[PDB]
Amino acid sequence: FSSNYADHKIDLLSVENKDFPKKQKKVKDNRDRDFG
């Protein structure tokens, strides 16, 4: 019904740097049976 004031509530400041941390590069740039 109603939400109240609390110290565990969300922040609008954290949402600004959150989407900044969501865009990067996904992909980037004695063996078996050895004889001579």
């Binding site: 019904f1 939400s3 565990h8 954290s14």
Partner: protein
Amino acid sequence: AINFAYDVVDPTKVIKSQIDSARVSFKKTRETANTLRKRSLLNAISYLNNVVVKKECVPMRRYARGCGHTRQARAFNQRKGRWPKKSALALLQVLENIKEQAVEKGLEVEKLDLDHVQICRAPKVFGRIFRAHGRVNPFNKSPCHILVAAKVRD
């Protein structure tokens, strides 16, 4: 503005309260709130204060792989138990707010009972870390929604 899954038969004598997207871990608040339903409201606040001072434990039932055994979990016929701090303080703030609306609407505090308790998942907040050989891995966290309704006894 999360809607409740509770079906209200009488609009009087039903008190609801709500916290949306709280900054507490989801898997730990689910473990604490499994035994709060069908209790008096006064017995709940006394029980949650004993978890903070480590006198009563919480029985882990769903997510319980790798929990230490203890003797305080014999009261639930169990063998595993833990005492989470920060999850109990978030649930205590919800139960005090219900007690304040009851004295404003003039209801009797002893007659109330907990009726509908559910929590659910929430959108994530992303993060970062830097590992060995120069690789980058995600480090995000997972909040939850908390929904609690209280009803008078007959």
